[PDB]
């Protein structure tokens, strides 16, 4: 199809571009604002302290960014409960990078753990996407009797039930969690949504991360992903 | 098969656990590392500069945190970075190397992902068929030499399956690792770790890196799409 694929590439490349121009246009001015603050603060500090040299201070900063990135603070990060969660981020290919592997050992093990883990997960999700497939099929099935009876043709019910497969799953797996997190971690609704979608598309910037509330999330992920596996493929056709 | 899938879940859950115990055992000893560095560095700077006062410097730091949180770097949203960022979204790698501060941007980021990913998913599926039929017709030439040297045509399908990988591997893993190790001055171990993390679309963003790289990604992913599925069967 080798002409059609070059046609796609060009579309993708124009898409990436058209994206980057929108992201830039939205972000750059606020980044720039932020950077004006810093740049000004740095300079004042140098002027205010003549015994300090620029090439001295410049190093100090490099430390702080590295240390703050490493997770120092001007509640253990590798307890069991966080470690599990981390382990989870790997197989799910979400990879927040919320925490980082310092040791080489860990990096090395991380490799083998991924190669095995991911497909093992990919299988399980394919299995859940069949059972969640046959779950929602049998779910609407009793109420399908009432739909057909109220003056609806058999071509039209397949679009209404397709919408409700989504709007119900959506309600459970998107709308509901957004409140939950917005409440729990005291984010905005916008943020909750943004987090929710970023998480489920398995992008996982890790810009955002999170007694009944602790385990509930691990579950929610698995079923949500199954749900969204289908939502993506439907768009693949739509395209 | 609904009994078999519950059996898998339990395996996954034991796997996650067995993982977390390994990660913990390796990492937990270096939790407080990061804070020791800072605390020590702060104090040296004070000792090294007597004209600086604690309560002066303490402010300056508070700025840094706020500015870094705001997204400055002691241009991050030029065109060339933005493209790359845009790329990280559709590929579902999502380093989070840079982050969307504005709400506008977050909002747009949503719609951009929903469209972009499947558009990419199509392209990768297309490349994984043509790169599929490319390597098949490539190693198809060397299949003639395998058959002649006391090998049946049932066994050549395993030898060429190995060489599909070992050649692709060479190009798409071994080669890049040197490249980056050299270029960005990482260790070979790190290069590998980065390479694999990138290609599995995990993208911690612990490690990140001129146009030749953008290409390499696309073909490598196609390659690794197949490498995962082969392990799925293998298991």
């Amino acid at each position, epitope marked *: 199809r080798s002409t059609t694929l070059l046609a796609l590439l060009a579309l993708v490349l124009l898409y990436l571009v058209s994206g980057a121009l929108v992201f830039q246009a939205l972000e750059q001015p606020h980044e720039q604002q932020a950077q004006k603050k810093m740049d000004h603060g740095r300079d004042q500090f140098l002027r205010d302290h003549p015994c300090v040299s620029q090439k001295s201070l410049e190093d100090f900063i490099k430390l702080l960014v590295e240390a703050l990135g490493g997770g120092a603070n001007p509640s253990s990060a590798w307890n069991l409960g966080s470690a599990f969660f981390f382990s989870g981020t790997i197989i799910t290919t979400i990879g927040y990078g919320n925490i980082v592997l310092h040791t080489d050992a860990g990096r090395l093990f991380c490799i083998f753990y991924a190669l095995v883990g991911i497909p093992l997960f990919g299988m399980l999700l394919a299995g859940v996407g069949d059972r969640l497939g046959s779950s929602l099929r049998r779910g609407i099935g009793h109420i399908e009797a009432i739909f057909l009876k109220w003056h609806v043709p058999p071509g039209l019910v397949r679009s209404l039930s397709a919408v409700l497969f989504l709007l119900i799953g959506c309600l459970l797996f998107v709308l509901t969690p957004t409140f939950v997190f917005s409440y729990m971690e005291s984010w905005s609704k916008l943020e909750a949504i943004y987090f929710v979608i970023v998480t489920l598309t398995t992008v996982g910037f890790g810009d955002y991360v999170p007694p009944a509330y602790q385990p509930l999330v691990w579950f929610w992920i698995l079923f949500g992903l199954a749900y969204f596996a289908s939502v993506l493929t439907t768009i693949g056709n739509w395209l | 098969r609904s009994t078999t899938l519950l059996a898998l879940l339990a395996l996954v859950l034991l796997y996650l656990v067995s993982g977390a115990l390994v990660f913990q055992a390796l990492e937990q000893p270096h939790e407080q590392q990061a804070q020791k*560095k800072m605390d020590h560095g702060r104090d040296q700077f004070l000792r*090294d500069h007597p004209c600086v006062s604690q309560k002066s410097l303490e402010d300056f730091i508070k700025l840094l945190v706020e500015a870094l949180g705001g997204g400055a770097n002691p241009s991050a949203w030029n065109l060339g970075s933005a493209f790359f960022f845009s790329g990280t979204i559709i590929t579902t790698i999502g380093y989070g190397n840079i982050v969307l501060h504005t709400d506008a941007g977050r909002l747009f980021c949503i719609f951009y992902a929903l469209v972009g990913i499947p558009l990419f998913g199509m392209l990768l599926a297309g490349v994984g068929d043509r790169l599929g039929s490319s390597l098949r017709r490539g190693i198809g030439h060397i299949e003639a030499i395998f058959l002649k040297w006391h090998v049946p045509p049932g066994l050549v399908r395993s030898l060429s399956a190995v060489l599909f990988l070992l050649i692709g591997c060479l190009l798409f893993v071994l080669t890049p690792t040197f490249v980056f190790s050299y270029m960005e001055s990482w260790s070979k171990l790190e290069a590998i770790y980065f390479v694999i993390v990138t290609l599995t679309t995990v993208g911690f963003g612990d490690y990140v890196p001129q146009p030749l790289v953008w290409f390499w990604i696309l073909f490598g992913l196609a390659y690794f799409a197949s490498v995962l599925t082969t392990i799925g069967n293998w298991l």
Partner: antibody
Amino acid sequence: QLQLQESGPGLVKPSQSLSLACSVTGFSLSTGGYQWTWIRQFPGKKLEWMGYISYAGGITYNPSLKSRISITRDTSKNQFFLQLNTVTTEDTATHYCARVQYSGYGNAYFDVWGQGIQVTVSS
Amino acid sequence: DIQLTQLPSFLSVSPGDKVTITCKASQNINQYLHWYQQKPEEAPKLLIYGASNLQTGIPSRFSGSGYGTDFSLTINSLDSEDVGTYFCQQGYTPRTFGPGTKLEIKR
């Protein structure tokens, strides 16, 4: 090129003050990013870092050896100076003058060293 | 005071050979460890800074690694010139050194 060369008395009498001096050529005391240090090597070749002074003139000391040491400097001559009070036969060692650099702020590594001066503590 | 134990104490090796020394730290040092070679009647030379980074103007046959407590310095291809006592020193105050590790070259 950068050169460091130690100076002072080869012999010191117990319960006196040892005082040495280091002369830097090809480089400035007061240049930002490099600090300066005194290190000693005992008979038996075991090294103890004593003290350490900034380009800016800030001081850090081995607490084991505090309350006897004072390091000073003279920016004009381009030198710096070690003192150590109430010397004993313990403090007999080969004193070394060295420049300090960082591998991220704080991480002190001594890149360029001095000739070495042998100081003895005897009656 | 952070204590640096360095093993082995002594060893001798033939030229061309590869060699590896250990420094073990009493606390977690977070990759802030440096390696020096002292020849007789001389002050130390800096080989390796920041655990793994090779000092400029020192041949590639030297290479160090480690993180945290346990580090190691490796010489790939001993020349006759590699004789001396080797030390490790840590970055945090007070800065402490290793006890020394003497390398004889067999012939």
